[PDB]
């Protein structure tokens, strides 16, 4: 029915091209609402960084560029890898990614249409998971 509803837990990160699931739509996040980046350690296996170092128009401050990302399952260049506070966050598109839902797959060209939710990168956690200066127990 109406009320286009699609939970992240229901939305999986796949390759519109491949479509084998390169991640989860509930494992990705946003960065200062500038560019969506799906965080995942096993993602490095789902993509290969180009040879060249930085290949972008200009460089950013809030974060630095990385390497051109390309779905290893297929190759469809997602974009480039971005680092922030020492966090490898791949910057993919919305047209290169597929949102597998129990209501039907969805492929947008703008995250502005993304059905699932995309929370910003919780640095507090990543910091609490990278520092652990708080506690372990
Ligand atoms: Zn691919």
From Swiss-Prot:
Induction: By interferon (IFN), virus infection, or intracellular dsRNA. Belongs to the helicase family. RLR subfamily. Monomer in the absence of dsRNA. Homodimer in the presence of dsRNA. Interacts with RIGI (via CARD domain), MAVS/IPS1 and DDX60. Found in a complex with RIGI and IFIH1/MDA5. Interacts with ANKRD17. Directly interacts with ATG5 and ATG12, either as ATG5 and ATG12 monomers or as ATG12-ATG5 conjugates. Zn(2+) binds at residues 15, 18, 71, 74. Residues 31-114 are annotated as: RNA-binding. It is found in: Cytoplasm. Disulfide bonds: none annotated. The RLR CTR domain is capable of inhibiting dimerization and signaling of RIGI and also facilitates binding of dsRNA. The chain holds residues 546 to 678 of 678 of the full protein. Residues 5-128 form the RLR CTR domain. Expressed in testis, nerve and spleen. Also expressed in the brain. It comes from the Eukaryota. This is ATP-dependent RNA helicase DHX58. Acts as a regulator of RIGI and IFIH1/MDA5 mediated antiviral signaling. Cannot initiate antiviral signaling as it lacks the CARD domain required for activating MAVS/IPS1-dependent signaling events. Can have both negative and positive regulatory functions related to RIGI and IFIH1/MDA5 signaling and this role in regulating signaling may be complex and could probably depend on characteristics of the infecting virus or target cells, or both.
């Amino acid at each position: 029915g109406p009320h286009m509803q699609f939970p992240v837990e229901h939305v999986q990160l796949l390759c519109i091209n491949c479509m084998v699931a390169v991640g989860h739509g509930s494992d990705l996040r946003k960065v200062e609402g500038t560019h969506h980046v799906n965080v995942n350690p096993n993602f490095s296996n789902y993509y290969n960084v180009s040879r060249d170092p930085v290949v972008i128009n200009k460089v950013f401050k809030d974060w630095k560029p990385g390497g051109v990302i390309s779905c290893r399952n297929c190759g469809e260049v997602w974009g480039l890898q971005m680092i922030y506070k020492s966090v490898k966050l791949p910057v993919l598109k919305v047209r290169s990614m597929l949102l597998e839902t129990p209501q039907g797959r969805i492929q947008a060209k703008k995250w502005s249409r993304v059905p699932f939710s995309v929370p910003d990168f919780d640095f507090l956690q990543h910091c609490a998971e990278n520092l652990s200066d708080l506690s372990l127990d």
